[PDB]
Amino acid sequence: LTFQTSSPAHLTMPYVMPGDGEVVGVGEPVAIRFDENIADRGAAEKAIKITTNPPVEGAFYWLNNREVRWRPEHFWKPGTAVDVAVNTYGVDLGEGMFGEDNVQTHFTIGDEVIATADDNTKILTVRVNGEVVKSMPTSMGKDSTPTANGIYIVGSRYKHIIMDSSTYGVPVNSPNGYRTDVDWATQISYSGVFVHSAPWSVGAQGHTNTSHGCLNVSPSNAQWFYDHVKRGDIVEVVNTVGGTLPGIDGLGDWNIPWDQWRAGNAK
Numbered sequence: 001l002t003f004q005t006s007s008p009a010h011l012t013m014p015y016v017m018p019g020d021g022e023v024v025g026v027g028e029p030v031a032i033r034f035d036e037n038i039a040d041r042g043a044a045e046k047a048i049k050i051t052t053n054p055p056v057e058g059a060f061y062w063l064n065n066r067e068v069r070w071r072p073e074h075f076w077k078p079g080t081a082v083d084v085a086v087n088t089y090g091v092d093l094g095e096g097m098f099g100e101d102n103v104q105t106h107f108t109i110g111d112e113v114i115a116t117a118d119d120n121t122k123i124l125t126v127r128v129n130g131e132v133v134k135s136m137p138t139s140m141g142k143d144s145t146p147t148a149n150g151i152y153i154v155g156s157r158y159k160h161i162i163m164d165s166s167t168y169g170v171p172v173n174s175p176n177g178y179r180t181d182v183d184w185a186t187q188i189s190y191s192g193v194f195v196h197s198a199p200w201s202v203g204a205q206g207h208t209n210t211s212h213g214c215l216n217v218s219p220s221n222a223q224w225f226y227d228h229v230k231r232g233d234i235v236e237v238v239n240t241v242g243g244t245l246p247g248i249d250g251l252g253d254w255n256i257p258w259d260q261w262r263a264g265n266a267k
């Protein structure tokens, strides 16, 4: 260990996901987010060593100037072990900004869990290692506020959460504002798409889209989803009238074509 002198106004710390020792789904990218913008992305990439077992080819792609992602071309093979060494201590990351410390994470890939929300049937079907285990009626985004098609990575889950218009700039007492209690909410996009309990749309679920974009399901089915899906599992939306989820959403990584992802956006 060689010591590096430092200043609190020229240091940046990396933060790695997923957590050390976690079991995650086949869609989980390695994520390294810095608490500062990174001027020299190539220097950050050269300081990060990702190794996998069984070994698979992967590559870095930056979602923005703060966070880089690493993933293979296809979903992970279940049982894969992944080691992440972020060896940024003392590294010159550009513009007088230096890496504050090293971080090391290890994680493993669990079962393959892919839930397909098909707008033609209004059914969300969960497959585990290829086998259907659950079929849930759903109501997705109305035509004016559709659910985007594409591959979504499961993120955080909440027993209870408040959806509040103030966060998008719309006061609660506006014609378009809302303050909504939601149970059993599984996040699948940073943009705000959740699978969640929607008692108010149970008659439409399986029939017609009435949501602002979220995947409405019954209270019991939402609780089931909360219990059985984990960070890194996949939700694929198909056949809606929306476009495609943006690749740099935060959970939209798999919608970027591999040739573009692998080419990267550092150098």
Ligand SMILES: *C(=O)[C@@H]([C@@H]1N=C(C(=O)O)[C@@H](S[C@@H]2CN[C@H](C(=O)Nc3cccc(C(=O)O)c3)C2)[C@@H]1C)[C@@H](C)O
Residues within 6 Å of the ligand: 145, 163, 164, 168, 169, 170, 176, 180, 191, 192, 193, 194, 211, 212, 213, 214, 215
């Ligand atoms: C489920 O539907 C889920 C929310 N509900 C949302 C909504 O009410 O629109 C969306 S938020 C997401 C952020 N980008 C788009 C969007 O167009 N937001 C928007 C809509 C109207 C006005 C404004 C504005 O002026 O700021 C922004 C959709 C998401 C699916 C939970 C949180 O209800």
